């Protein structure tokens, strides 16, 4: 939170899939994983 409006000064890395923030370039990568669905093996339902 900053006086006025956000924008001036933000984490060095911010996801786009959802819009999260991180500090360690890696810490962010790991997250991106949760944004990579993995369809099941077989019929959708049944
Ligand atoms: Zn995300």
Curated annotation (Swiss-Prot):
Positions of C2H2-type zinc fingers: 13-35
Location in the cell: Nucleus
Domain of life: Eukaryota
Family recorded in the similarity comment: Belongs to the krueppel C2H2-type zinc-finger protein family.
Function: May be involved in transcriptional regulation.
Identification of the protein by name: Zinc finger protein 484
Species the sequence originates in: Homo sapiens
Gene field: ZNF484
Span of the entire protein shown here: 771 to 803 of 852
């Amino acid at each position: 939170g900053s006086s006025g409006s956000s924008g001036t000064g933000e984490k060095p890395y911010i996801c786009a899939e959802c819009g999260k923030a991180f500090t360690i370039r890696s810490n962010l990568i790991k997250h991106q994983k949760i944004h990579t669905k993995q369809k099941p093996s077989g019929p959708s339902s049944g």
